[PDB]
Amino acid sequence: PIETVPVKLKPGMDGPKVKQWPLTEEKIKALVEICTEMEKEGKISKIGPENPYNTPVFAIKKKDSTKWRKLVDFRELNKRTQDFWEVQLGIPHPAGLKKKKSVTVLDVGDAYFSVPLDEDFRKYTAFTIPSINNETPGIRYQYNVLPQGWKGSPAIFQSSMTKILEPFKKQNPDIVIYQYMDDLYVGSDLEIGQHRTKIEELRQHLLRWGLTTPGYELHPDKWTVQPIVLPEKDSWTVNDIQKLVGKLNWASQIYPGIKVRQLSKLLRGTKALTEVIPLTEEAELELAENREILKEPVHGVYYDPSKDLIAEIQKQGQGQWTYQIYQEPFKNLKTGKYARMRGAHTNDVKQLTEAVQKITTESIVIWGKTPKFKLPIQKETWETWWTEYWQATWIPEWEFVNTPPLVKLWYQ
Amino acid sequence: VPISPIETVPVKLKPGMDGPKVKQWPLTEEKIKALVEICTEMEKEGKISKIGPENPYNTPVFAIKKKDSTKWRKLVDFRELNKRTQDFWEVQLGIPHPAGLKKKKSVTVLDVGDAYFSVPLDEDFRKYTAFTIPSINNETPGIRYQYNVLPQGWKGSPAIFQSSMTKILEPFKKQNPDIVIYQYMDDLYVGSDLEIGQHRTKIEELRQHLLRWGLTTPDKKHQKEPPFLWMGYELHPDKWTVQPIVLPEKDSWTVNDICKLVGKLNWASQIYPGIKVRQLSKLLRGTKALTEVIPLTEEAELELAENREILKEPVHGVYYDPSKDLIAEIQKQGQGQWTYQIYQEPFKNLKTGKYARMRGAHTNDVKQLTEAVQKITTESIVIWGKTPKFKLPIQKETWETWWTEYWQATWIPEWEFVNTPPLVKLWYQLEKEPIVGAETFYVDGAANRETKLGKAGYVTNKGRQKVVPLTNTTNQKTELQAIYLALQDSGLEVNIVTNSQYALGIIQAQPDKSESELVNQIIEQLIKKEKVYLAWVPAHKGIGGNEQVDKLVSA
DNA sequence: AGGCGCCCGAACAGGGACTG
DNA sequence: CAGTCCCTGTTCGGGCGCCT
Numbered sequence A: 001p002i003e004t005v006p007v008k009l010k011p012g013m014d015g016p017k018v019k020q021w022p023l024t025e026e027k028i029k030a031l032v033e034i035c036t037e038m039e040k041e042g043k044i045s046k047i048g049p050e051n052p053y054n055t056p057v058f059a060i061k062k063k064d065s066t067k068w069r070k071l072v073d074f075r076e077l078n079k080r081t082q083d084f085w086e087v088q089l090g091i092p093h094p095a096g097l098k099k100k101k102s103v104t105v106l107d108v109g110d111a112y113f114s115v116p117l118d119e120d121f122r123k124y125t126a127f128t129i130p131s132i133n134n135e136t137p138g139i140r141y142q143y144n145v146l147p148q149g150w151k152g153s154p155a156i157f158q159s160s161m162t163k164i165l166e167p168f169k170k171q172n173p174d175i176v177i178y179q180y181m182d183d184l185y186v187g188s189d190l191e192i193g194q195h196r197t198k199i200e201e202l203r204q205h206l207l208r209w210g211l212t213t214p215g216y217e218l219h220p221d222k223w224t225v226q227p228i229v230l231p232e233k234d235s236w237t238v239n240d241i242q243k244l245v246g247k248l249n250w251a252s253q254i255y256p257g258i259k260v261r262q263l264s265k266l267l268r269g270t271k272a273l274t275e276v277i278p279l280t281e282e283a284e285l286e287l288a289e290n291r292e293i294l295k296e297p298v299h300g301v302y303y304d305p306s307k308d309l310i311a312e313i314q315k316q317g318q319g320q321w322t323y324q325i326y327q328e329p330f331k332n333l334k335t336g337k338y339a340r341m342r343g344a345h346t347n348d349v350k351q352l353t354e355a356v357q358k359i360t361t362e363s364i365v366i367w368g369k370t371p372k373f374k375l376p377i378q379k380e381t382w383e384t385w386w387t388e389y390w391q392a393t394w395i396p397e398w399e400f401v402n403t404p405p406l407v408k409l410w411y412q
Numbered sequence B: 001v002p003i004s005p006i007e008t009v010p011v012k013l014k015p016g017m018d019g020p021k022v023k024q025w026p027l028t029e030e031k032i033k034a035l036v037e038i039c040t041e042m043e044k045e046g047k048i049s050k051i052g053p054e055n056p057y058n059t060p061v062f063a064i065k066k067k068d069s070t071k072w073r074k075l076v077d078f079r080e081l082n083k084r085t086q087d088f089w090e091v092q093l094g095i096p097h098p099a100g101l102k103k104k105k106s107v108t109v110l111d112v113g114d115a116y117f118s119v120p121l122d123e124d125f126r127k128y129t130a131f132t133i134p135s136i137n138n139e140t141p142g143i144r145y146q147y148n149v150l151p152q153g154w155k156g157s158p159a160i161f162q163s164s165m166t167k168i169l170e171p172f173k174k175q176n177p178d179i180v181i182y183q184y185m186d187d188l189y190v191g192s193d194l195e196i197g198q199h200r201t202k203i204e205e206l207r208q209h210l211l212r213w214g215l216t217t218p219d220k221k222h223q224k225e226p227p228f229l230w231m232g233y234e235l236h237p238d239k240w241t242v243q244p245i246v247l248p249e250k251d252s253w254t255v256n257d258i259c260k261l262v263g264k265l266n267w268a269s270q271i272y273p274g275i276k277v278r279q280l281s282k283l284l285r286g287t288k289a290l291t292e293v294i295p296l297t298e299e300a301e302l303e304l305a306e307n308r309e310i311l312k313e314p315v316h317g318v319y320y321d322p323s324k325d326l327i328a329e330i331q332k333q334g335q336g337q338w339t340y341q342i343y344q345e346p347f348k349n350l351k352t353g354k355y356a357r358m359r360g361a362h363t364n365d366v367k368q369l370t371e372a373v374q375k376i377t378t379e380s381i382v383i384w385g386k387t388p389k390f391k392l393p394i395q396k397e398t399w400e401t402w403w404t405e406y407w408q409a410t411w412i413p414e415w416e417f418v419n420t421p422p423l424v425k426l427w428y429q430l431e432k433e434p435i436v437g438a439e440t441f442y443v444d445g446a447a448n449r450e451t452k453l454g455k456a457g458y459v460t461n462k463g464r465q466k467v468v469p470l471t472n473t474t475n476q477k478t479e480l481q482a483i484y485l486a487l488q489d490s491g492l493e494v495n496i497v498t499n500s501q502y503a504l505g506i507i508q509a510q511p512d513k514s515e516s517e518l519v520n521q522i523i524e525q526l527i528k529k530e531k532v533y534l535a536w537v538p539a540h541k542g543i544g545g546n547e548q549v550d551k552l553v554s555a
Numbered sequence C: 001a002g003g004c005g006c007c008c009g010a011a012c013a014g015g016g017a018c019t020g
Numbered sequence D: 001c002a003g004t005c006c007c008t009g010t011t012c013g014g015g016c017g018c019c020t
């Protein structure tokens, strides 16, 4: 018997009606055995045909975990509860979280099952557990408590979270604590030994305040940005000079001071691609002057809170993938490269999934926000498999791209 | 007072709306004499009531007919009430495929009678029901009433039935974990691995649990009737098949004939292996009227023939055995057509299928194969809830060469080679590096937007030039057009420099087929070469011999 | 009247390069 | 700038198949 924070769908829009996608029998078993328990505990309960709403559900194992986690795709719901969270209650984003030598991510989502949910809102949490081959119809539930992964849930539990943590923050004023959905980001410049200890210390607090918590560490101070770089060549073919000028011509959308003039004149006649052409000094000085402008920052690139983040991924071959996060073309807030992720040399989709998760993470630690991805993949390919490689409790927004390689030039 | 059978389902109205008032619409004069009485029947059974003052509600009649009836089936039209009624979460998410069912020793079918009228309507919603229909011809204006149950043709009926039924059966199933029930509409299909007689024990014992809720299960139910006929299927506990397909032999061919034709073949493809619809579907291209006259081409007839011999002998599918692995094997049928069989024990198929869909303007076999594999995986998850082990006509090196090169993320799940020609191959590869001692063709093209007139040509390191005038063309086509020239005029190894991002993009994905005859031609030359290195430079940067061929064609 | 499949066309998005 | 085109991919709407 405690209060309930009323909640409303922002004006004009309805509850999510999105269709449930087919699950593996593996995942269908894990959901049944997970939901029956959540029913017994009165977290969710069965619903009828009078409720015409659905959100998709599936299950995942977190990285290095043999236990099945239930996962709801609340993206559609979260879009329709939005004014509630952003405008109404703010979370200051620690600009320091990124500078900490270490940051651990703890799953606090369980805490959310305490609080009751506005009885009027519950009809929008409706989700179907499907059957193999359509033999039974769906088992449909709705959420009585605060559903994991909904954007209101970390919001409404805000007061309670800020409370239970206040003891710890006071004894440890230098430790930085951020919260994004089901996750709690905790970081410090402490040596890892006492860090891992201070996290357990944090584990006990929520342990004694009625929460459970199933390394997790990120190391943001070590995060590198991948700069554009022109090759180092002893001797240059026409073809080399050509690939160089073209790359430089592209890069110049980013840096206006790049010049191809003298390097261009080198190509003058119609010459064999493999013919070897010596570098004039006037060009040699132009090339060396460019390599300089490419060690600089970019005028006027800064994060604007109101605008959405956008992330682009290119497949570079042999396990490498490059990415760029930006809010406006050619102004990149970050550029990077990944290699030898799980799946390297065998499964592209696994690797891209890994990439989207690492990118989303840095994106939350940095701006406290998940990016919108442009994925170098066919819609159906991604959709058929991504659910297999998914280790995260959130779900970024994505769209599908076909961009044959002239932008492949974020890496040699 | 009436009485109270089974748990009731809350029903609202689309907020800020209320029940309908309507004028009558035509219905046949003969059958309409029967119902004047029938309403009086239901009063006594609990299915009807009335009030004079309270209903500003009226509804018309429009119905749909069914074959194979020894008596006529009534209907009422709520179309006005419907649109004004809340939406439901639909219960039918689609239907099980016969091939996904596990073999059951014993399989029975109980048919629930008065199925829709056996379910209590929501107390508070009953009101919106009032209706009127012609007496015989007519005499007096009429009378009206309200519904105490689920009306035929109401938006909410199937959904509320399905959920109540599910709700009832639930406690039985838990007490009988190893029985297996399935509900389609008002019919239930039950099956078990118990002994033939002890099974019928549970069949009545279940007819018990249903009666306890007022659900009648007659004995027209048949243990001896199976095969059961359900939605085009014939089902025996051991094996299933499509119901017999009649392929028109008609000499008269209307675009509507080919259509009905194709649809039947496509329906045949779940079971009879190797059906090809490609050439017949071509006839259908760009026709104005569905009644139009069309002749059969030799290919389309050569195809129609091969399909007929497949249907000649009958065939049957097996059922699924969770203990044994799933296997999907694909064969290339050419012309971007694909067929697959999914089996467990060799030569006994669970099901078959085609993948014919040509996706994109320019494509190749690897891509189309990758796509079929995705079609099959998706289908496999729906049906068996797992992914099959794939047997594919493609060398493990062919595939490795493709996916690791392609710019997109692409994947096939666990699969092995089956050497069953035609094998899937890459018909050419572009060099990763300039070819020493090959002629270097700088190519360009330009056309004028207004005149649709243009020229395509090239310059080489050896001094060789060419320029060809072209009529009724576009900027893109000329850039393709110049690469084409450079292929034709070059030896077995060649480097080509193009500034067309458009052109570079097509060729680099190593297409083996195209909608476009010019790209097809580029392909044919590409397959003939030993070594082709194709490079890009930015336009108008005063580059190479690119500036020169630019002058030539800009001229 | 709707569900699931196919094949086709016509509409609609959006990405670059040319018009000026 | 725009504004235009040219091209290509997706997504929707219609006709059959199987059925309510």
Ligand SMILES: Cc1ccnc2c1NC(=O)c1cccnc1N2C1CC1
Pocket: B096, B101, B102, B103, B104, B107, B180, B181, B182, B189, B190, B191, B228, B230, B235, B236, B237, B238
């Ligand atoms: C039409 C249908 C649809 C779905 N399942 C079944 C059936 N009927 C069967 O013929 C059937 C056959 C074999 C095994 N299960 C069957 N059953 C399941 C109920 C035992």
